[PDB]
């Protein structure tokens, strides 16, 4: 049994690939380079600590769900490591000011505003084949209007280009993210290695005023590690993902940070009173947080 | 007549198998291992007290009909007995939190999110041949997009794989459930030993608020026992199937529980006033209910 | 002429059988045992007062035409006389609750849900040869999927089995009814002794609400008596065919029931005011209606 | 890398055209004749110093956003250079008095008030093919009612005519501007070389009274130079765009004008105390401002 | 250029009709019979000296704007020339006393107070086809309640009848005026040859008391001559449009009347001191004013 | 012309009914039975000499306008001829004492004080269908509160019942009057054959004291004769309409009564000195006035 189980299981893996079947409880992630999403709770949920390079990723949610902020944060993290990013825009909504406050190197962000949906996919493929771009972001699947319509179709346009793109993105190790509201048929649903469902579940108030959104992200599909885990974090208006806020919570769960009622302490010293202050501290001590985060990752990844 | 009747009848049985013809009134169920559906009224309707191992089962209903809750409950019951379960997902909708509140051992639930419809069927076949999995659940037939379409077909894909799967599932005694909305042609309709039609018929209110769904399940096909019997039960949000609620009703019908207007009693003592309280009691006295349930089964199965 | 006419006519009859030619106006029905259809107006249209035993009958109409209700009513009438009935199901749609409200002895109804179309036909043949079943009902011709398709064909499958079935059904005096939507080719069209075309022509309203269907049935083929006569009756939801309603109308046409504007009388006494009340009465006086019906039959059959 | 980057990048350009991809930070504008928008801060944001001739431009914003003032200013600038302008009106709102105070040569402004939306597009095409008009302005997309509606449709009407118009406007080097509130589908969104988003963000007060609007314009689409840059300027009631006001601010940013607390100086002499006075001066010394503006352009374009 | 300009321009005209495009500065009016509006400054603004016969005209403004007075004045002028007028009333507000003081021949004014909006439009069409009525006035578009509403719709009702009406009004050379507050959709907006926007901009005081309204009329649409010109005049309570008052002002602008500070003179003699007296004079010398007016028209039309 | 005019005109009449168009100057009234309003000047303005039977009439004016007095006077005149009257009250304001001083037969006045607005309309319809009531008066439209509101709506309630009421009131020749302040939408505005606008324009003083109201009534809608004529008369407190006062004035206008400065004479003899005395006389000589009135009517009607 337990012998023939892990046995056949392996059979399915060589016969169908890595991750063709998994115990939802397993921790075994694959050997894949990963770009952070900007959320520590999400990087964890993902299993590999971030989004897999060379794969197609889908991020979808309603309006004001925070799906753009997410995609921007990954661009920031990517660029923050020397990775060249390209933004394929069909929405014409990018807010460079907000992007900058998030760490995006707007000046070096490659941008394309294609004439049709087919053109966008084609420009994506070309970039994929250049082996010169590390991450591509398509904003968004719903805006990718087929040439015919500009002058059913959408599903065929996506299908018509998904196999080639995937192969090319794989061969050059390029990460590609499609932002969606799902439109485009099943091509994207099945070729994607990761599919994220993001939505606003509440508000973040600074007393009487609203300063952010209480966000939830579910990894509904994951071919790199176990799927169905979720992540909750805050997106503060004009600032982005409350990372350090997560670091506090997760630093206390994994018992790396001590909480004495309202006081948080790390290895001998106090860092602050209240989540509000603990966060303030960590954000105030870069090299320390990088250490706490690293332990949290080693522990949970 | 009555002699030549039961005579020819038997002839049809050896010539065509067990259950090729049945008096809808008969009680003769076959010698088959069965996994509970989580509904006592359904286990009864099924005749064999549950779903038959080694057979293909189809469960279908509209959106929000409770077909997933049902399939989850059987996984729970299965795992709750040491059976290894696999969830072949093509919907990417599994809610692990809700599953857990239902008793599913998420950690040990095997999960596969195949690249195509053909791949899913193939992974099912492999698992069927491993003789290492006890129950497989495919979610769902409509999402099993054929490779060709990803790049008529659906009906051929199902047919193309149904005979082999059935043989393999039979030889290893593996139970396989297809969740459907019917799509896939006739292959599934004819190979399935049990076909369940589930739908939401009303709401369950806790006064002014809605806390669940009034559900009805019809066994439209049954090759293990007489078909066409139905079952009615409640699915409480965040909790699952109101089993003990059924146990009360069925415990009173079969006269195992005495009802004095609003008071329910079992063998000398009172257990509660009102269906609400009787249920509360039974759910509060595990070993007692297991006894009442056992009598109800011996009586009705 | 008139001499040589009836002369040659007879010649065609001995040379080709009974009913190979008929004056549409004739009344001469054959010596055949007949099961009621549940409609008095239909039993009449049929000429022999019902469906002929030992023959193949086809009943066809669109969805919601009332073709199932019809077939159920004949099963009821059959069982209501000690006849053993078998329901060969390939639709998996039987509603036992509604069947019961119609008089069907569900408990004693034999039921078979075959693996293929060929199997169903074969099970029919076997039952036909048992000489133990009086009436068989196949639901339905369109659902009788050929094995090949499950893994042109339909027409061959029907043809391949029609001659044998007919001979066997004849030798054992078994009545067989195929429900259709025509599918299956010409085999059924030519072997059937009776072909009924049924359809919903209007609604039956109880004031502001709809409580039934205004039905029409045309005997498009009849090898037992003159063909092309039609029947109109009501099918009341949850109740079946408004028989007594027919009995009133037909009781007045044949002048067995007197109508005084809005008052109906039978042999000296009044039975009710309005069709609604007359019906209520007759349904309220079983042995009286049986008498009126008997006169109506003797008169019109 | 950096070699293969600029390499593939070029590939995308020849394969897809000029500006199919751009580093948002780049300054490389194309070889295109450009008409001023009347805003120095906007001409800059545009990259090419103004709107591109021979292309379709879209300007959109809410009511009272200043989108008309903008379109009028470009007509003024155009005519102020011998360019022939045509105003395709479907709003019937043009204010000739205000237009004149802005520099529009009303007398020579060609005007058409078409019978339908299709007619307007057709008149546009004809003018485009005449090679006799330099700039066309359509007021507005939302008012372009389809003939059918006058007696879904709108999107088809726009699509039905966009390819032809674009080709014709290109061949004759005619600039065409659509004013919108977006209506008309995707045809305009994808064929447009420039899409401007304009809106009123605040008021301009002369103490206690409101004399103008604080305006913001975002270049959400730009196929002639990098997109996403924005421009802020004032629209003074009855006067138009506070150009010289911009010239002051931008003259100080680029260090061409010295600011000593409240005193502004240009090459040795003082021009005024306070933004209010500096502006007054520049507007008072035409040939001087033309020089400062020219330096600002050479520096920022 | 200037050659190919006037060239293509002509092309647009034959291809689309007369006035499909115009230099707002042009003076070329069409060959159309015209009824005076009662305002000399308006007749001029109109270009053709009045409202075009055989066309649909729209006059709209708020309550108390003077739109009725205007429509009444044209009826007066029309009747004052033998033209037969019809007043289609749905407001039930006509003031015959005031109309008379304006010159309307109430006794000969045809009047209809239709049962529905559709009926009114139909009565208009019939009158249009009679070729017996010269001018029709509909009071008012907003009161034209659709039959359905009496028992979206309004826009369809107008559209449903506009093409036919226009053709019929054209063929019989009938002038039709719709008074509006815009309601009725785009049908009227596009079929109308002239659209007038009228509103009260101030009061007219006879010292301490208010005796009239300072009115402004903008020709927002004109398919007979250049559009967008405006007219200002006074409407004196109980008297109507201060025509002669206009004649004075316009007689001085075109230098046909000499003004010596406060004295007005015409060809050698003095006519009065002050606008008040000059007007008094002209109104006192009919045949003289008719001459001055004629020169003013020849000069400005 | 004059031929084709009266021609088409007739066409509109047969096509749309009697009075679908009229020369405001015409005198041609229809063949309709009419009840006096109590005002001779109003009966005249109406054209048919009174209110049309079988039609819906609306009377509206502010508070204290005299609209009730008017409606009471018609009831008096009606009853004074054997006509049965019904007063549908929703105001609960009827003053029986004042009504009596006006000639109303309170004792025989039918009265209904309905539970809702719908009920009132329904009671009106029933009375209309009885063919037993000659005149119905609804007091008042504004008080007809819709059932829903008692527990937009008003307009629908009126519309919902206006067509039926009109047909029924027509078939039984019943006159129905709605008193209004307009409320109820357009249903009443368009179905009414006559709409009266009544208001108090001044006081009637008996020296130093005020004894009545100077009233004006405008027939703003009239489908029985030319509309827009008005009537002026006095309503004396506690007495009603100063009829004979009108008879004097109108008797002098039509030259049936001679006025010698302050003396009034009729056919040879003097009747009084001063309007005050002439009236006193006529009111003092019933059969004489009836004669003068009859001549006045023959002359002016």
CATH number assigned to the domain comprising residue F42: 3.40.50.300
Residue in D180, D166, D129 with CA at minimum distance from that of residue D55: D166
Query: Cα–chain-centroid distance for residue A105?
Result: 18
Residue D298 within any structural domain of the chain: yes
Measured distance CA(A89)–CA(C59) in Å, rounded: 61
Beta strands in B126-229 (DSSP E): 135-139, 175-180, 194-206, 209-222
Q: Would you call B159 and C151 a contact, using CB atoms and an 8 Å cutoff?
A: yes
Cβ(B256)–Cβ(B210) under 8 Å?
no
**Comparing C-alpha atoms, which of E198, E190, E191 is closest to residue E176?**
E191
Q: Are B271 and B278 in contact (CB under 8 A)?
A: yes
Residue F14 backbone zone (phi > 0: left; psi -120 to 50: alpha; other: beta): alpha
Q: Exposure of E4 by Cβ count < 10 A (0-12 exposed, 13-18 middle, 19+ buried)?
A: exposed
Question: Are F205 and F299 members of one domain?
Answer: no
Which member of E84, E116, E133 has the closest CB to residue F190? E116
Provide the domain count of chain E: 2
Q: Is D27 left (phi over 0), alpha (psi -120 to 50) or beta?
A: alpha
Element (H, E) at A151: none
Residues on chain B touching A5 (C-beta within 8 angstroms): 84, 130, 132-133
The owner of tokens 């030549």 is B4
Q: Which residue does chain A place closest to D196, by CA atoms?
A: A92
Q: Shortest CB distance from E123 goes to which of F21, F23, F229?
A: F21
Radius of gyration of chain A (CA): 20
What is the dihedral sign for C-alpha A164, A168, A171, A176?
negative
**Which ranges of A21-62 does DSSP label H, i.e. alpha helix?**
40-45
CA angle E289, E291, E295 (to 5 degrees): 115
Q: Which of B78, B141, B139, B131 is nearest to B109 (CA)?
A: B78
Rounded CA separation E144/E121 (Å) = 9
Contact D22/A at CB under 8 A: yes
Are E132 and F187 a contacting pair at CB < 8 A?
no
Distance CA F8, CA F4 (A): 6
Asked if the C-beta of C153 comes within 8 angstroms of chain B's C-beta atoms, the answer is no
Identify whether residues F252 and F235 lie together within a single domain: no
Of B96, B122, B150, the CB nearest to A228: B96
Give yes or no for E216 touching D (CB within 8 A): no
Q: Which two tokens stand for residue F24?
A: 């405001």
Q: What does the buried/exposed string (b/e) look like for B280-295 if buried means 16 or more CB atoms within 10 Å of the residue's CB?
A: bbbeeeeeebeebbee
Backbone angles phi, psi at B26, to 5 degrees: -55, 160
Interhelix angle for B275-284 vs B243-253, to 10°?
Answer: 110
Residue C261, burial from CB neighbour count under 10 angstroms (0-12, 13-18, 19+):
exposed
Q: Find out whether the peptide bond into C267 is cis, omega within 30 degrees of 0.
A: no
What residues of A are in contact with residue D228 (Cβ under 8 Å)?
Answer: 94-96, 106, 111
B242: tokens are 């109101």
Q: Which residues of C touch B21 (CB under 8 A)?
A: 86, 110-112, 123, 127
The tally of CA atoms less than 13 A away on the side-chain side of residue C140 is 18
Q: How far is CA D233 from CA B35, D65, D178, E177, in A?
A: 73, 12, 22, 44
Q: What is the DSSP string of F64-109?
A: TSSHHHHHHHHHHHHHTTT--EEEEESS----HHHHHHTT--GGG-
* Chain C CB contacts of B7 below 8 Å: 130, 132
- The closest alpha carbon to D241, from D66, D122, D14, belongs to D66
Q: Determine phi and psi for E32, rounding to 5 degrees.
A: -135, 135
Helix axes B117-130, B153-171, angle to 10 degrees: 10
Strand, coil or helix: what is E7? helix
Alpha-carbon gap, residue A246 to A226, rounded angstroms: 22
Structural contact between residues D182 and D154, judged by C-beta atoms closer than 8 angstroms: no
Look at E132 and F229 and tell me if their CB atoms are within 8 Å. Answer: no
F179 shares a domain with F271: no
Chain B residue at shortest CA distance from A187: B150
Task: For residue C1, say whether it is annotated as part of any ligand binding site.
Answer: no
Would you give the DSSP letter of residue F190? H
Evaluate whether F203 touches F210 at the Cβ level (below 8 Å).
Answer: yes
Beta partners for residue B99, in sequence order: none
Which burial class, exposed, middle or buried, applies to F251 when counting CB atoms under 10 A from its CB (0-12, 13-18, 19+)? buried
Identify whether residues E283 and E257 lie together within a single domain: yes
Candidates C150, E192, C46, D163; CA nearest to B162 is C150
Whether residues C126 and C263 fall in one domain? no
Burial of F300 (0-12, 13-18, 19+ CB in 10 A): middle
**Residue E171 CA to its chain's centroid (Å):** 21
Domain assignment present for residue F41? The answer is yes
Max distance between CA atoms of chain C, in angstroms, equals 68
Structural domain includes residue A146: yes
Tokens of residue A133, six digits: 């771009």
Residue E153: CB atoms within 10 Å: 12
Please give the full DSSP string across B56-75, using - where no structure is assigned.
EEEEE--TTSSHHHHHHHHH
For testing contact with chain E, the best of F2, F4, F6, F8 (most E CBs within 10 A): F8
Q: Is B1 exposed, middle or buried (0-12, 13-18, 19+ CB in 10 A)?
A: exposed
Q: What gap in Å lies between CA F73 and CA B98, rounded to an integer?
A: 78
Both structure tokens of F93: 């304001």
Residues E273 and E158 placed together within one structural domain of the fold: no
Please indicate whether, in this complex, the C-beta atoms of D20 and A123 are within 8 angstroms of each other: yes
Owning domain of residue F229:
22-242
Q: Which residues face C110 on adjacent strands? A: B23, C86
CA distance D234 to D276: 13
> Hey, what are E106's tokens?
């109430």
Neighbours of chain A (3+ CB pairs under 8 A): B, D
Residue D297 lies in a domain: yes
Kindly list the distances between the CA atom of residue E45 and the CA atoms of A261, D108, E30, E229, in Å, as whole numbers in the listed order. 82, 18, 14, 5
H or E segment and range at residue D114: none
| Whether residue F251 sits in one domain with residue F126 | no
In sequence order, the 6+-apart residues with CB closer than 8 A to the CB of A105 are A76, A79
- The verdict on a CB contact (< 8 Å) between B7 and C130 is yes
CB-CB neighbors (< 8 A) of A189 in chain B = 92, 145
Distances (CA, A) of A200 to A45, A55, F145: 18, 26, 46
Q: Give dist(CA C264, CA C278) in Å, integer.
A: 6
Residue holding tokens 């006894």? B291
Q: Where are the alpha helices (DSSP H) in C46-172?
A: 67-79, 96-101, 117-130, 147-150, 153-171
Q: Which of B83, B110, B121 would best serve as a mutation to test chain A binding (most A beta carbons within 10 A)?
A: B110
Residues C93 and C228 in one domain: yes
Q: Which of C106, C110, C121, C125 to mutate to test the interface with B (most CBs of B within 10 A)?
A: C110
Which among A12, A228, A230, A231 is the top mutation candidate for probing chain B, defined by the most B β-carbons within 10 Å of its own β-carbon? A228
Q: Which of B9, B15, B227 has the CB atom closest to C113's CB atom? A: B227
Is C117 part of any known ligand binding site?
no
Report how far residue B283's alpha carbon sits from residue F22's, in angstroms, rounded to the nearest whole number.
86
Q: What is the spatial distance between Cα B195 and Cα B203, in angstroms, rounded to a whole number?
A: 24
Report the residue from B8, B22, B163 with minimal CB separation from C151.
B163
CA pair distance A105, A111, nearest whole angstrom: 12
DSSP secondary structure letters along E239-261: TEE-HHHHHHHHHHHTTSSEEET
Q: Which of D242, D258, D293 is the last residue of a domain?
A: D242
The answer to whether the annotation marks E140 as part of a ligand binding site is no
Task: Tell which residue, F176, F278, F222, has the closest CA to residue F49.
Answer: F222
The vertex-D116 CA angle with D110 and D121, nearest 5°, equals: 60
What are C180's strand-pairing partners?
Answer: C60
Q: Does B contact C via 3+ CB–CB distances below 8 Å?
A: yes
Strand B230-236 relative to strand B240-241, pairing:
antiparallel
Residues in chain D within 8 Å Cβ distance of E16: 114, 119, 122-123
Distance between CA atoms of residues D74 and D81, nearest Å: 11
Three-state DSSP at D181 gives: coil
Q: Which of D191, D213, D242 is the last residue of a domain?
A: D242
Within this chain, do residues B176 and B32 fall inside the same structural domain, yes or no?
yes
- E147 at D interface, C-beta within 8 A: no
In a domain, E124, yes or no: yes
What residues contact residue B273 under an 8 Å CB cut-off, 6+ apart? B262, B263, B264
Which residues does chain D have within 8 Å of residue A108's beta carbon, measured at their own beta carbons? 23-25
In a domain, F231, yes or no: yes
CA–CA separation, B124 and B130 (whole Å): 10
Burial of D127 (C-beta count, 10 Å sphere; 0-12/13-18/19+): buried
From the number of C-beta atoms within 10 Å of its C-beta (0-12, 13-18, 19+), residue C220 rates as middle
Residue B65 annotated as binding site:
yes
Residues in Cβ contact with F85 at an 8 Å cutoff, skipping those fewer than 6 apart: F75, F78, F79, F108, F109, F110, F133, F134, F135, F136, F137
A66 is in an annotated binding site: yes
Q: How far is B185 from chain C (nearest CA, A)?
A: 8
Q: Which residue of chain E is at minimal alpha-carbon distance from D125?
A: E12
Chain breaks in chain E (C to N over 2.5 A) after: 151, 181
Does C touch A (3+ CB pairs < 8 Å)? Answer: no
The arrangement of strands across the sheet holding F56-60 comes to F110-112, F85-89, F135-139, F175-180, F56-60, F194-206, F209-222, F230-236, F240-241
Query: For residue A276, is it within any domain?
Result: yes
CATH of the domain at F269: 3.30.250.10
CA-based torsion, A97, A98, A101, A103: positive or negative: negative
Three-state secondary structure string covering A15-27 = HHCCCCCEECCCC
Peptide bond into E81 cis (omega under 30): no
What's the CA gap between F269 and F250, in Å, rounded?
18
Strand, coil or helix: what is C94?
A: coil
From the list D269, D256, D245, D278, the residue with the least C-alpha distance to D40 is D245
State the method: X-ray
The token pair that represents C74 in the structure block: 């004949």
Is A298 labelled a binding residue?
A: no
Rounded Cα distance, B211 and D148, in Å: 50
Q: What are residue E269's DSSP bridge partners?
A: E266
Report CB contact under 8 Å: A107, D187. Answer: no
Q: Which chains touch B (3 or more CB pairs under 8 A)?
A: A, C
Resolution in A: 2.6
Beta-carbon count within 10 A of A285 CB: 15
Q: How many CB atoms lie within 10 A of CB B37?
A: 27
Q: Is residue A5 part of a domain?
A: no
Pair type for strands B135-139 and B110-112? unpaired
Question: Cβ-count burial of A140 within 10 angstroms (0-12 exposed, 13-18 middle, 19+ buried)?
Answer: buried
The residue written with tokens 């070993």 in the block is: B287
Q: Which residues, including other chains, have CB under 8 Å from residue B281's CB and lie 6 or more apart?
A: B264, B271, B272
What SS3 class is residue C260?
Answer: strand
Neighbouring residues of A154: CB distance < 8 A, sequence distance ≥ 6: A117, A144, A145, A146, A183, A184, A185
Counting Cα atoms < 13 Å in the Cβ hemisphere of C252 gives: 18
D229 is in an annotated binding site: no
- Report, in angstroms and rounded to the nearest whole number, the Rg of chain F calculated over CA atoms: 20
Interchain proximity E127–F12, CB inside 8 Å? yes
Structure tokens at D275: 């933004």
E strands along chain A, which residues? 22-23, 34-35, 51-52, 56-60, 85-89, 110-112, 135-139, 175-180, 194-206, 209-222, 230-236, 240-241, 258-260, 263-266, 269-273
For residue A257, what is the enclosing H or E element? none
Strand-strand pairing, F230-236 and A194-206: unpaired
Chain B 217-246, residues with CB within 8 Å of chain C CB atoms: 220-223, 226-229
Strands B56-60 and B194-206: parallel
List the chains bordering chain F where 3 or more Cβ pairs fall under 8 Å: E
**Six-digit token string for F221:** 């809608």
Residue in E4, E159, E221 nearest the CB of D131: E4
In DSSP terms, B264 is beta-bridged to B259, B272
Q: Which of F229, F110, F117 is nearest to F178 (CA)?
A: F117
What's the rounded Cα separation, in Å, for the pair B166 and C99? 33
| Same structural domain, A211 and A140 | yes
Are A123 and D222 within 8 A, CB to CB? Answer: no
Same domain, C279 and C197: no
Q: What is the DSSP string of D4-53?
A: HHHHHHHHHHHHH-TTSSEETT-----S--EE--S-HHHHHHTSSSSEET
Q: Which of residues 50-69 of A touch B (CB under 8 A)?
A: none
A284 token code pair: 């105030």
The answer to whether B92 contacts chain C (CB < 8 Å) is no
In this structure, are strands D56-60 and D175-180 parallel, antiparallel, or unpaired?
A: parallel
Contact E106 F22 (CB under 8 A): no
Strand partners, F265: F258, F270
> Under an 8 A CB cutoff, do F226 and E150 touch?
no
Q: Which two tokens stand for residue E164?
A: 């036919």
Q: Does C66 show up as a binding residue in the annotation?
A: yes
**Cα C115 from Cα A32, distance rounded (Å):** 48
- Whether F and E touch, i.e. at least 3 CB pairs below 8 A, reads as yes
The distance of D33 to chain A (nearest Cα, Å) reads 22
| One domain, residues B264 and B231 | no
Domain end residue (candidates: D222, D242, D262): D242
| Contacts for A46 with CB less than 8 Å, ≥ 6 apart | A34, A37, A194, A219, A222, A224, A225, A229
- State how far the alpha carbon of C289 is from the alpha carbons of C38, C256, C285, E215, in Å: 14, 11, 6, 90
- Residue D155: exposure state from Cβ atoms within 10 A (0-12, 13-18, ≥19): middle
């Amino acid at each position: 049994k337990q012998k023939a189980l892990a046995a056949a299981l392996g059979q399915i893996e060589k016969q169908f690939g890595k991750g063709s079947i998994m115990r939802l409880g397993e921790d075994r992630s694959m050997d894949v380079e990963t770009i952070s999403t900007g959320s520590l709770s999400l990087d964890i949920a993902l299993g590999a600590g971030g989004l897999p390079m060379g794969r197609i990723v889908e991020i979808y949610g309603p309006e004001s769900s925070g799906k753009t902020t997410l995609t921007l944060q990954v661009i920031a993290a990517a660029q923050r490591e020397g990775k060249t990013c390209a933004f394929i825009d069909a929405e014409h909504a990018l807010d460079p000011i907000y992007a900058r406050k998030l760490g995006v190197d707007i000046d070096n962000l490659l941008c394309s505003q294609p004439d049709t949906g087919e053109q966008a996919l084609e420009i994506c493929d070309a970039l994929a084949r250049s082996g010169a771009v590390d991450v591509i972001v398509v904003d968004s699947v719903a805006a990718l209007t087929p040439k015919a319509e500009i002058e059913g179709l959408a599903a065929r346009m996506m299908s018509q280009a998904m196999r080639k793109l995937a192969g090319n993105l794989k061969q050059s190790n390029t990460l590609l993210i499609f932002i969606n509201q799902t439109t485009g048929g099943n091509a994207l649903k099945f070729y994607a290695s990761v599919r994220l469902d993001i939505r606003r579940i509440g508000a973040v108030k600074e007393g009487e005023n609203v300063v952010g959104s209480e966000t939830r992200v579910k990894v509904v599909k994951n071919k790199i590690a176990a799927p169905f885990k979720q992540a909750e974090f805050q997106i503060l208006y004009g600032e982005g993902i409350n990372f350090y806020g997560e670091l506090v919570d997760l630093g206390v769960k994994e018992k790396l940070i001590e909480k004495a009622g309202a006081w948080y302490s790390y290895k001998g010293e106090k860092i602050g009173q209240g989540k509000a202050n603990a966060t303030a501290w960590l954000k105030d001590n870069p090299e320390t947080a990088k250490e706490i985060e690293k332990k949290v990752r080693e522990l949970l990844l």
